[PDB]
C-alpha cells in the first residue's frame, strides 16, 4: 500500500531535502552531537577531534576554506532535535506509504 500514490512523491521529496540541512559537512554522516564551530558551522563533535588532531595547527573549516580552532567550538545543541525529529518523520512515511527514503 503506497497510499494510492496520492501526493506521496511530493512528501518524500520534502523528507529528503530536510535531511540535507541536518547532514554532515565532512563525513556525510547524520550528525548526532551538533556543535557550533568558530565559523558558525555544525559538526558531529568527533569530526572536530580529527580536524584538530591533524598536525596542521588550527582546524580548517571544510565548508568555506578554514577559520577554526580548538578553544572555539562548543556543544550548543541547536541542530539536535532537528536531526532526531526528522528521523521520526521518515519512519512514519514508510509506516503508512512504505516508500523508499534513501540508500
Amino acid at each position: 500500500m503506497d497510499l494510492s500514490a496520492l501526493r506521496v512523491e511530493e512528501v518524500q521529496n520534502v523528507i529528503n531535502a530536510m535531511q540535507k540541512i541536518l547532514e554532515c559537512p565532512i563525513c556525510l554522516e547524520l550528525i548526532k552531537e551538533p556543535v557550533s564551530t568558530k565559523c558558525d558551522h555544525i559538526f558531529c563533535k568527533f569530526c572536530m577531534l580529527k580536524l584538530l588532531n591533524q598536525k596542521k595547527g588550527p582546524s580548517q573549516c571544510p565548508l568555506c576554506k578554514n577559520d577554526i580552532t580548538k578553544r572555539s567550538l562548543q556543544e550548543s545543541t541547536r541542530f539536535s532535535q532537528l536531526v532526531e525529529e526528522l528521523l521520526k518523520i521518515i519512519c512514519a512515511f514508510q509506516l503508512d506509504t512504505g516508500l523508499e527514503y534513501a540508500n
Partner: protein, 97 residues
C-alpha cells in the same frame, strides 16, 4: 467512520508541528524565515528581532552574543521553506480551474 474519509497524511501532520517547534522563533513565537543564530546556547531568533537586543544576547538563557554582525543561517532558513511544503501536502489543494 471518518471526518473526511480516511484523510491520510495524519502521522505526517504531527511531524510537521514537531519540526516547527525547532524553527519557531523565540520572540515572534512562530515560524521564522532566514533567521540569525546569536543564541550560542540553545536559543534562536529572526534576523529582525535579536538586532534590538544584541548588546546582551539571549533574553531567556541570558547567554552573551557570539556574533557581532547580523549573520544568517542558510540551514535553518532552508528548513523553514521545506516545512512550508509539507504544510501544503497535508492541506492538498483541490481545484481545477
Amino acid at each position: 467512520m471518518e471526518p473526511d474519509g480516511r484523510g491520510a497524511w495524519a502521522h505526517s501532520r504531527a511531524a510537521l508541528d514537531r519540526l516547527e517547534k525547532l524553527l519557531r522563533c523565540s520572540r515572534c513565537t512562530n515560524i521564522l524565515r532566514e533567521p540569525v543564530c546569536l543564541g550560542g546556547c540553545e536559543h534562536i531568533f529572526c534576523s529582525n528581532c535579536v538586532s534590538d537586543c544584541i548588546g546582551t544576547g539571549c533574553p531567556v538563557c541570558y547567554t552573551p552574543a557570539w556574533i557581532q554582525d547580523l549573520k544568517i543561517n542558510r540551514q535553518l532558513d532552508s528548513m523553514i521553506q521545506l516545512c512550508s511544503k509539507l504544510r501544503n501536502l497535508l492541506h492538498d489543494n483541490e481545484l481545477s480551474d
